[model samples]
Target chain A: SGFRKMAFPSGKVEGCMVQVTCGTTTLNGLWLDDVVYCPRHVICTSEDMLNPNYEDLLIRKSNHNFLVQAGNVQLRVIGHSMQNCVLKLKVDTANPKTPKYKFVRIQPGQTFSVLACYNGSPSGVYQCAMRPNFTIKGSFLNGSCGSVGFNIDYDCVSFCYMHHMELPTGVHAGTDLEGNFYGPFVDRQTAQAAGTDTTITVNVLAWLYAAVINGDRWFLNRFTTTLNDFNLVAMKYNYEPLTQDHVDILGPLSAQTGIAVLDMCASLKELLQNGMNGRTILGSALLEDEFTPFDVVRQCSGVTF
Target chain B: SGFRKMAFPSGKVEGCMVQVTCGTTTLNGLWLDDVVYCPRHVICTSEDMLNPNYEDLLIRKSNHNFLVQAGNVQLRVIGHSMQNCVLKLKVDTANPKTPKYKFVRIQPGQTFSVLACYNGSPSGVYQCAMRPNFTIKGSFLNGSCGSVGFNIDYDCVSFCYMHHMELPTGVHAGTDLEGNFYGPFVDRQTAQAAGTDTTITVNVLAWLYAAVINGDRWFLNRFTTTLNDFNLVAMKYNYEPLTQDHVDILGPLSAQTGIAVLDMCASLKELLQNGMNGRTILGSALLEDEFTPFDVVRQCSGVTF
Candidate 1:
């Protein structure tokens, strides 16, 4: 896969140069490395690394998972605002050409999670709602005219449903529900540990959790101060909204005591506020280490902070 | 700065809801939090963070700097391919509407550095070039159609330039050339240590190095296999391209034994190839630890790998 799309020096692409010769023409131009790729006139590049396709020259992301962070990971297609809906995304939706204004629905009196969704193993969840009459106002430095260019930010919102809750909080038991354990890892330590995972279920949760957590990077925006609360209980006790696919796949397990789809993602926080009584329940790094978000989630769960 | 723009419960804003009441009308809408800030009809939000101005609602990055992974951090506008163009950039210049393809010049017979550019403090250096005709081919997962979207990878290539050669490679000394040291740090360990720094200049370079290194994130793309070689010598020995700000300022010290503006960044690799004979020159974590790329750069430089 990396044959031509991979960056030279092994995983690098930006700032790297490439040259090619076809017949009589041996033209040279700079591939605007990272922020810009200036392929000056030629449709193709000779060096695989130099080729835009080397790193999938497409302006996109992969394996993009969503994190709820403190909101419902569900898109309110019928009528939901950004507060309850997880992963707020607004795009220059109309086609960068017509460039319509993507509205960010902020209903009154609702609490929302402030997540910084960056491109990583797993990002926060998103759902798109095409609405009108919304506008964003602010200023940013544009590199084009060197001052102000387009003030555009496009992301989404969605219903908060996760197969596993262990990941967004950094618990890596290192396995997926599909029994797949692998890494094109962002965190070397997490990836290395994932390869040796034994609990596919728990590991799956952990992986998913990290993905969600990572997807909501602390870089672009800030996140819950409660992230430190991510742990084992959050996985076992958290709720997940069901999808039609989930109904078919997991609805059978619906009444299985701890596997309720209606519970959604609030189980972890719910148990924490009520049963936890402001105390730490089931919590730990869960990276083959001691664990819990604890106390309330489990009858014998160790209480921790 | 957060007067009316900070998210609720502190730094949160993406999914949090904010309601406002004016006159008898209590209108409510979702603020596409982090990614998209939808201010349905009201540019101002009663909640500071809910406002697009919350978190500087501008589609831009701050503390953006440049890095030179393996090549010169100088923009080769006279004709340097992506390899040496440092941080590459290409924008859909005419406007998102008339979006014209920003050309990425790829010359034949050149080895360029491949870098993954992301938004972060101290990103790699980037220069602008207005070229024509280069087109990139690729497909990406577009959320718009539920699949396959735009193929625009806009990063940039700049003149291989730097104020200090230490940072893009790593090696934090906890200081800067300006004698000012600080952090809203990316690396926790580095920040904590920097608060207690004694070397401003070396620390500055180390910080800059991390900026470039971090700016060219691995999550977005791959980077150099030689990143491990970053060390003290890279800071003290690597070259920095002069800026008008630097020339008028440090030109007097230009002749100083170690501060050469013309050397650009290759000095680190240059020494390793020639005097190092393909060996590590001077390298280390430099966080109050051991050091060297070794064998050649220094008179009695400790040889290391």
Candidate 2:
């Protein structure tokens, strides 16, 4: 029936300065454009189109080298001298909450790589935004945060520097966060290291966070790997049993929640992998088209990495 | 970035027609707009809305009964005769190239039902319309062969059936299909069953089907499962292998004719799952409030047993 509920797009985008009237009241959220950018350019090196290498340099209060090579890449940032620098990736989970932990501001001169890998469809088109750590430097310059706010994806296991701002007397430019499909970073140290042979390690555990942030729908296939295998198949191991404590993490809804989420993610990943594999199967992309995790090292301080 | 594919509608009902389309083709293929007449409608016995019991045989054909239900409760059948009729799910994954199967003339007395079950979401929205099945007889019988195809989704797997009056009519409807999601039934006898619980029993392998459908992208969680845990955790059962025989049976490329139809079907199921979940999280009708495996079963058939 016409009156029946249908999933139609409710043409609206949340943005700042815009009178976003929800029902009747106007909202006060940061403004964003309805049109996403074209040619979603990612950092593709001459060697690794699937996964790129990361780069960085040591810096304190003096200098920070953010040299990200702009080899036909669509997005890159540049800035002058800096007091402190960091990068980050954020998700609102379609909720209007105050945001979870702001996570770790990466070490001054470490490469924090996060890949935007999807198993079902291609990484979506999104405009990359750049921010300096001035906001942080203005309030708490040379300060340190704990690991509570820091979380990483399978591509980049651990490096919490998704945002940065320079001080008023300091620099004001940086690179947009680069999301790779695969990254091999265990911690800040491993993520900060720029290496070619490094595997793009995205801890599949991110699916839980994604479910919480965006809702359970976002990662229907979040559990699957590039190969479409059931993640629970590993329960045959000597690892911690799926406990009630674990289900509590997801809000204590259902015992099968974790299992279902993992299975869905895996399925989605497998679908995307199959699509990519089909290109190869059809003698187009080749087996090398298989996505191997790699680090996205941006090598620029302010701009022109 | 700018170039993105679109999607289509699933489990749609206009007047008395329950319509679902397939393929990227807009408004082509075997589109049906039949009048659904469900003379009986009953809610599931499961108090847990998440676990709705298989309702009774609202529709029966002689002694052969049809069990039909809605996924996520969205299986809204609209025909005047939709009530009291036996609902039987019909899954025909056979491509039209081979002559192994014949056309099904669903005249007047033939009973039908929604096949797939709803996992959790009220309905798989994002990936809806993949299997190319129907939700109500209204969506099925309104229009007949040639130029009367239904629309399920908008991408990768949109298809329409054609009239095969060329063949001598057989008593059986579903037979010799292609794909793992095919009739868990091999011969015609099993395919013609009316009231057996086998349909739900065999396909109850939701987790396993997800595993086989999603080969590798599936990952197990290592850490959290709360509003926070939505990432890949551990690789589950790395030793599992996908053989050519398995590919022939389950592979999307099994038929190599269409877009690995099974993959498309599973993908739609996931999307519906995600959509239903999204709707519930946001408390909106614009998305699927439910998409349980039970819904899948109901939409394809009338009774679940």
Candidate 3:
């Protein structure tokens, strides 16, 4: 145990990993040791660099793990609304005509993360579709889903940022990839008979994650340190600093954690971009440092390079 | 006016003015022309400074400008919540026996900003109290207001920050400074006999303003500029940068705008210090680059001049 220059075991090391969460679901152990080692997959070395799949792999077992791996793509969906919903990642493959669909049922409001390999084509584009299905009045309300499809062109290589996509609300009916349709609307007869018109609105919030085929450790490092710096500042106010154990636990989950922050920042950016009028609200009761995500993007956006 | 060499206005000359808002009520005209002018007040110069009354002045000709001036102190109440509420600024006067009160009715969920002069004592310490009274059902909810009393002392000199404070939730009874009591608790019969125990919680969010006597214009300048920087960033994302017209219009209400940002940043800072866990929230919605407030304090907290 003392064979190497040992830093006392505080359980975990800071900057070594990070954790990403969406509600109760968390994607942990995103190793930031500067080495590519996907859980369940063989130790990935420099040789695996030739195949981005090995570089962008995640562990999977018979149990529960949202990580989905395709030919050269892997996706982890996190931070999604938990009200019964289905998350689908569609990656265009060589067969192009029919994109593959991977679906996961999410609780109420939580994260549904995905990591993918993009060896499909030179100009690889991926689609993320979320369909909500929750029960109210003994009937399952399912159908109209929100989807954002984007191309993971080479630019995403040097780019790791979170962006937000709005889900259409109201009594609109829609069809999913499988052709299943749903709506939060009522019939014309009921509307006419009641004189009073009612429209049910489904407020669904979704985030888009863009990154390189093989994740960049540098981006992850900056992401992790930035997050630690954020929490550290808050802790300082109460005379509390992160324990070594806390840092160690958070260090390895850098990818998920970094993406989570990106999602939050992107969503906040969307709110500001939309307009500075009306009852514009930022921050959430569920999250601490709710204001940090918005603050980070606002300050960092002005910094050149 | 055309004699001096002119750099063509890029629509609006940057770094000339700022804007402050409390909910839908915006306080524009915060000039940065190196001149001192309140929004409703005249260009308050040194000649006005000799009286201290003019130097620490707030216009009171009528309308709804809550600029409270007393002794060598001045205050302005900008953004405030619309719900029925009484905002009181209590200052210790020459007769130390009792404090002076400046009362104003506030709209719910908006900022009720105030600026005060502290000639009463050499050290600038003042008390800010907010008492709430809003109607619900058939009765009015009133009572023990939230109060943060502190001394502006020398430490607040160069410190400009925003903090958030939480209003106690749940059914708890309390009394205000005026001795009026309030509670959302259910009756003893309803609690003991009926299984339905109800607790109506009132979420009252408020901010406390702290500052040195006679205020610092340079600090106000930096403060105003910093706030404008925030709004500019948000506007940039929407293809709308500050225009010349916007700056020209918001170049006079320097004091109020400067104090509003101060009030917001000060409140946010408190949330962190009070042990609001998770990623503690800070920063204001009115402007972008809100993190600068915290960064400014963290870096300058050690400075001694």
Candidate 4:
């Protein structure tokens, strides 16, 4: 059926129109045949806006007589912590008024609860769209002849670029100015009360979300990519390579994934802000790099009075 | 009672007034008696306001009588994951009001909870001299004339200062560079699924309160004598030297007790602005002399690689 032009088996994707969207941007391709990167050179697309022949891409195979007999269908998840995380599957035919977008809870390790919706509705010339808020999204259509498959996803920790810094470890040591005579500064009971010497560590997380892209990575990418080429060329003159010092201080990364880095910095902040200060009765100081100032730093050797 | 020197039954008084007023600045013989290092040169008759009197400048003998009384007593706690901890006190006076201050439960333990009112009410000061809210500010007044006293507060672990440089011992190693090889970045799971080796640790206790100063250490003579000077002087200059550098970059330490520097800063501030990062996460660029960042720095090195 494809030497002159590919044709569906009349019932295949014949009832309802098919649409594909990955997030807000419409997708044009279904597989390798129709696959093409968008003008942004990031992510895939199905449309050939320059070419009028571009059609809603399809996955055609002989063994799998996939005829998506339904039109697009809406899939939703109903529950708390489920404000938005659903997918839409297109069908070739609009058989049921209420699409069977069943909610299935997927229990992963670590008390994580997941609700998923399957696009197993009737099939036709189906176009699938996904919910923007879902961690993963895609569209699928099914047919009586066989099955037209697609994907629906909405899960996982979001990723982004980040700015981070390694903290410094400084060794601390204190010397007694006067010999033992029931020292006037600290008494025995007070010293004993004060207990052993300890060291503390602190960490600081960098701010990536607030400083760049207004806390958005995708929007920034889309905005930057959509700008005019001539204008971009003109803007090239304004570009200045950040010096090493600037990179060290502010970090070297575009708005693309800055938030992710800051998230990491936040994780670091948590660790230091909560660690123990071993003991302060001995010698107090954070062990630089090694975190090793507890025992070794306190013992005195080589001289005895 | 002589006209030149009046000897009341309570004690010998050089002034006409029965209860002498204690000003923060003015020095009286009682001031030198209760506080050390406040120069013997200043103590004198409240009436004369001149010539010093060192003879009557002595603390009255301990009158450890009415065994148990409670008021304005406080216990400040800070740390992570304290949900399991419970305060088991040896209740010298097991009045039901004490349990109100007991910690029923503690989550990640970064919060500061005031057990009771700081001043006024049944559980607080009756006459309310200088008592904090919700605190029954009673003292060692009218009881026995004998040995030691007791109020055993147990299980609460002591906390330490200098939390700037501590960190976890190990962390993820060389994760990002491998990500660089894969053109576009992969999500954490995808990276892990593709063997992207990510390591994370949940060691998140920042700081914990150590102890409560009951009437025990108040017995010792030598140290207490010296401490009288330090406590008085330190209490006087408590937060008067707070500099702009201290508040803006470093947090303010306004409280007089072993308060988390931030706690002091917050108690004093009207808005309770976030420290450094506006969140609990520590900031690196701003160096706090009191914090220790050693452990976090080293762990960061491991993850960074």
lDDT of 3 by residue, B174-268 (tens): 22222222233211112312122211101101111111111212212222233355344334333123333433332322233344433333333
lDDT tens per residue, model 1, B1-305: 00001110111111111222222222221111111111111122234322233223222321122111111112111111121101112211211112222223331111112111111111111111111111111111101000000112222221111111112212221111111121322211222222222222222222222222223111111222222243334444332222344334333333432334233223323432334221211111121101111101111111110
Worst 10-residue lDDT window for candidate 3 chain B reads B1-10
lDDT computed for candidate 1: 0.19
What is the C-alpha lDDT profile of model 3 across A93-122, one tens digit per residue? 222222122222222211111121111111
Local lDDT at A12 for model 4: 13
Give the poorly placed runs of model 1, Cα more than 4 Å off: A1-305, B1-102, B105-305
Task: Place model 1 in a CAPRI quality band.
Answer: incorrect
| C-alpha RMSD of each candidate structure in angstroms | 28.8, 22.3, 28.8, 33.6
What is the iRMSD in Å for candidate 3? 29.2
- Superposed Cα deviation of residue A54, candidate 3 (Å): 38
| Candidate 4 segments exceeding 4 Å error | A1-305, B1-91, B94-156, B159-289, B293-305
Task: Rate residue B11 of model 2 by lDDT.
Answer: 23
Q: What is the clash tally of candidate 2?
A: 212
Candidate 2 vs candidate 4: which has greater lDDT?
2
- Using TM-score, rank the candidates from best to worst: 2, 1, 3, 4
C-alpha positional error of residue B220 in candidate 1 after TM-score superposition, expressed in Å: 29
Model 4: per-residue lDDT, tens digit, A18-75? 2233333332111111111111100123242222221122121121222221223432
- Candidate 1 chain B, which ten residues in sequence have the lowest lDDT sum? B1-10
DockQ comparisons of all candidates to the true complex: 0.01, 0.02, 0.01, 0.01
